[PDB]
Amino acid sequence: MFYHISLEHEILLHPRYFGPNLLNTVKQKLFTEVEGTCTGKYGFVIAVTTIDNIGAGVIQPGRGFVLYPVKYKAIVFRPFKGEVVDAVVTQVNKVGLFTEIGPMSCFISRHSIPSEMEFDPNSNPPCYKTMDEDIVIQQDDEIRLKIVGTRVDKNDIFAIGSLMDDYLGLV
Amino acid sequence: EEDASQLIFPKEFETAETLLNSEVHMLLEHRKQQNESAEDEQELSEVFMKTLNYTARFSRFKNRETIASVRSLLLQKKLHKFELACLANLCPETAEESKALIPSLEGRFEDEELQQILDDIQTKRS
Amino acid sequence: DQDNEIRATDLPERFQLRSIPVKGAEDDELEEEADWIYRNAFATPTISLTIQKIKEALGFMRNQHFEVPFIAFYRKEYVEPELHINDLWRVWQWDEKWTQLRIRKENLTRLFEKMQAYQYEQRALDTTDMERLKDVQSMDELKDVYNHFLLYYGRDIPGLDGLAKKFGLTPEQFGENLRDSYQRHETEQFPAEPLELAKDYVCSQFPTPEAVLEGARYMVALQIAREPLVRQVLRQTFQERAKLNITPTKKGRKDVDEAHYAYSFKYLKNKPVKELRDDQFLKICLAEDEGLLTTDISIDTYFEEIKQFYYRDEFSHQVQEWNRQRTMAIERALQQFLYVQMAKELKNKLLAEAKEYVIKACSRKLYNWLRVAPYRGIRVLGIAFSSARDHPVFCALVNGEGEVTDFLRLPEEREKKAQDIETLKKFLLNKKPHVVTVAGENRDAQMLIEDVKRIVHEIGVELVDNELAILYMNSKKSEAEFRDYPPVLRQAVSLARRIQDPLIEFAQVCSSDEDILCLKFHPLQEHVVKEELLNALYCEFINRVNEVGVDVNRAIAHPYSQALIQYVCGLGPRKGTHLLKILKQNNTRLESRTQLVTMCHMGPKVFMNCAGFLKIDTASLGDSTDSYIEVLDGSRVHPETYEWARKMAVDALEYDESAEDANPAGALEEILENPERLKDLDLDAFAEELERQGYGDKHITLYDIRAELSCRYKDLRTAYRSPNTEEIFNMLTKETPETFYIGKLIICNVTGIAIGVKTRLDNGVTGFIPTKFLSDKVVKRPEERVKVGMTVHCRIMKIDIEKFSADLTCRTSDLM
């Protein structure tokens, strides 16, 4: 879920970057470091909104690098298990249904799908209709879900959805 | 242990500020407007794009003022901050749907009290 | 295990593989099948690239369980001259689409019936359940019928409608008007203006009665865009009048310049879809997927024409408001529902048509590969090589049966070449090969073939393409069959086997989908659906295998040929392998072909399908095998027609029907010694008498049963010609005539002034900058213009395919 928190980061700056463009360079160097990454503590960070303040540049003795502890205000995406969210169906397969929750994707097997939504591989589009073929749930549909499990894979989040709860379908 | 159904969140995330999908769409669009201009600048990543379309597919309202109003009418009650966004993005029709989808709404409020708020949400939907 | 029943069942192995199982017809659903297939598979496409015949073919396939080869090759009179092998394949492919559409229609009919029951328990369905579902001639309009159903009745699984109905001309009527192009249904006035009716419905969700107007217009737009009739009319409009607009993206303007494939359409404006070429739209969609180009499909207006119908004339000023509301409702519907979805549908159709053309091109190339004949078994010597810079050349003498007999390695330089030539001549004298084949890799093939010619004349020598040999070399099967040989030796054996017969080598080396896809059938092969391309290639293989017929007794004795009885009609991977296993276990080789069911357990339907397309080498048998031989088994003739052969032979010999001495076998065993006697028989009079006796029309079958007794498995392939100079040019160079874009920019390396400037291309093609640009014939050398040795990139202005010479350009003005 998208959130807004004030996070911090300390970046080391090479001496040649000194001069009138110094603080401008500090900002421009922070920008391209922490965007679109993910962590096991705060989760996926979407983008940085504003930079709170630059710390005082501590000249590291021995090397020319000066490190600036800079606090920033960014919007972060961390899903939790049991949250009910909306997503778009990306692929329908007999092995399972693939969705996409923003920067993270999930997957739903037939086990999590009650027997109503039966396979449709004979039709050109793989969908999951019912015996009467009224509720047709195919690719590219805003189908809600419930994250029943979270998993981060080397700075890449991967939750797992389900379809066991009622009112999980077309709005 | 971390299940938002029973409202258990880490300390780093308890004091965090919730955001609505339509709410973050405006911020992302503003950043897109900032970076698409100011040439001699890095272009936006595909992650930015896949969040743009994601929050654009679920924009219940596009007006800036419609956001603070729907949050003001919610913060006046005694709901949790976590219930602020999941109950403002999905926009359930009947209070029974909201209570069945969210286990924390069962027994937390009265049925008609919840449904009046749900009807308010449906009215504010454009 | 599924394989067990597949091998045990009585249907063709390829019939059980299909997703939609083949179920019998009724002769009334079969006629509808035929009509739908004829209309849909024989209708003009959107890009520039008898029903009784289809009825008969479908009846055969679905009731008689006759595979497309058995229909093409023994049911000609039913399908010919209007249906051929590829036509039958297309019909059987479209049968799957018909079955899918029919199952979808049945499911939707059951849904509509359940919904009618539910509503009767409580708009409604009166003729839509019949009119729409029954009249569904395509999957697309089936979506139009269903989605329209979902719009209204999708809410119930077990009041803005007031404004929409008070909007005049209910959506079905609007669809009728659009279909008729004139106001068939008049509009319905109201004794008020839109706002006053808005006050009634503006309560909670839409205060500010303009909001209820917006809601009502949105409802009307949904109802219009979901109406099946409006959908049909607008899809037709898109089909006929559709323009293609294309512009390059920021990533596209820079990296598409006279060498990127999308250069010709980097900028498009109102390009009608009717003018799209064979695979042009496939390339357009691939370029758009790469992100270097953006497109859109539209008609520009059409909205101005449409708005005239949902409209009223009088200027009362209380209908101008209604007219404006209706006009903007149609505008919204068209702009955000119909235009976008119709563009998506048209783009999908055009892309699928381009994919189909690419698949057809690959199929045609494979056909040309497999329709190249044997050579005139034969001892073939195959020479293969590589860059040759510190790398030897291997030649393999492959026996006529296809088994390699022996190999020879052929590794200051003048004497080494002389010794190599001497040893090659010694080998040729010792073991005289009928044909010497040189692989095709680069210019060195020409020198190799010329040296082989110089050797042989003191027996032909032909250049051979080297592309299936590379795949064989890299394949693990080459390692399996030859553990000791180096890879280049595998190329020699592959070349010899292919020259002996391409079909026997293509089927053996293209044993899997991945192996077949390794070949280069078309530049866009990788982008078409794997399933369709594989099906087309396997259909080509099946056609050529049944049109050749597979010799059984050689596939067993020489297991190299086992792969051919996979593509026999009626007789698949599992079935073919089971038949081979049975023959191997019984340790018996077919002296006779009606013996298939006698010694094996293959059902009547499979025997009927497969057995016409299996050869028996009756002239090759001897020793203990002489004990049992049916002489008709050595031919294309099938054991349902073996009485008509043994009447045709008796009649052609004028044997007295009243003589107890008219042995019908012995009459054939005189006709197969003297086949010229069959020319004196009037087959048309014989066929008219069989038809009178109630055996049906057999005119075309009797002409085959004559042509076949005149030559046992008469080969129809075009003989192994030598490749034309264009073929050699495109083979050794490894690029096509389109690749040699006259005016293309190429990086070439200058070698030395022989009066001109010799530049060696990376493509192995010599590049001669003309003396006109050089400007020095008897004047000082062109050293001032450029230093010898280095590389330059120039533009082609002439070609010498017969000599591998290409004009170049030095002036940057030509470069511009």
From TrEMBL, chain A:
TM region(s), chain numbering: none
Any one GO MF annotation of this record: nucleic acid binding
Principal subcellular localisation of the protein: nucleus
SUPFAM superfamilies, alphabetized: N-terminal, heterodimerisation domain of RBP7 (RpoE), Nucleic acid-binding proteins
One cellular-component annotation, GO: nucleus
Keyword Calcium: no
Biological process terms in GO annotation: DNA-templated transcription initiation
Alphabetical list of Pfam families matching this protein: S1 (PF00575), SHS2_Rpb7-N (PF03876)
Subcellular location(s) of the protein: Nucleus
Keywords for the protein's UniProt record, in alphabetical order: DNA-directed RNA polymerase, Nucleus, Transcription
Family matches, as Gene3D superfamilies: Nucleic acid-binding proteins, RNA polymerase Rpb7-like, N-terminal domain
Domain S1 motif: start-end pairs: 80-162
InterPro entries linked to this entry: NA-bd_OB-fold (IPR012340), RNA_pol_Rpb7-like_N_sf (IPR036898), Rpb7-like (IPR045113), Rpb7-like_N (IPR005576), S1_domain (IPR003029)
Membership in a protein family: Belongs to the eukaryotic RPB7/RPC8 RNA polymerase subunit family.
Protein function: DNA-dependent RNA polymerase which catalyzes the transcription of DNA into RNA using the four ribonucleoside triphosphates as substrates. Core component of RNA polymerase II (Pol II), a DNA-dependent RNA polymerase which synthesizes mRNA precursors and many functional non-coding RNAs using the four ribonucleoside triphosphates as substrates. Pol II is the central component of the basal RNA polymerase II transcription machinery. It is composed of mobile elements that move relative to each other. POLR2G/RPB7 is part of a subcomplex with POLR2D/RPB4 that binds to a pocket formed by POLR2A/RPB1, POLR2B/RPB2 and POLR2F/RPABC2 at the base of the clamp element.
Protein name per the record: DNA-directed RNA polymerase subunit
Gene transcribed to yield this protein: POLR2G
Automatic annotation (TrEMBL), chain B:
Primary subcellular site in the record, as a coarse category: nucleus
Keyword Cell membrane: no
Gene Ontology BP annotations: transcription initiation at RNA polymerase II promoter
Ranges in a coiled coil: none
Molecular function via GO: nucleotide binding; translation initiation factor binding
Origin superkingdom: Eukaryota
All copies of domain RNA polymerase Rpb4/RPC9 core, residue ranges: 11-126
Locations listed in the record: Nucleus
Keywords: DNA-directed RNA polymerase, Nucleus, Transcription
GO cellular component: cytosol; nuclear speck; RNA polymerase II, core complex
Record flagged with keyword Transcription: yes
Function according to Swiss-Prot or TrEMBL: Core component of RNA polymerase II (Pol II), a DNA-dependent RNA polymerase which synthesizes mRNA precursors and many functional non-coding RNAs using the four ribonucleoside triphosphates as substrates. Pol II is the central component of the basal RNA polymerase II transcription machinery. It is composed of mobile elements that move relative to each other. POLR2D/RPB4 is part of a subcomplex with POLR2G/RPB7 that binds to a pocket formed by POLR2A/RPB1, POLR2B/RPB2 and POLR2F/RPABC2 at the base of the clamp element.
Family in the record: Belongs to the eukaryotic RPB4 RNA polymerase subunit family.
Protein name: DNA-directed RNA polymerase II subunit RPB4
Organism, scientific name: Sus scrofa
Taxonomic classification: Eukaryota, Metazoa, Chordata, Craniata, Vertebrata
Residues represented out of the complete protein: 56 to 181 of 184
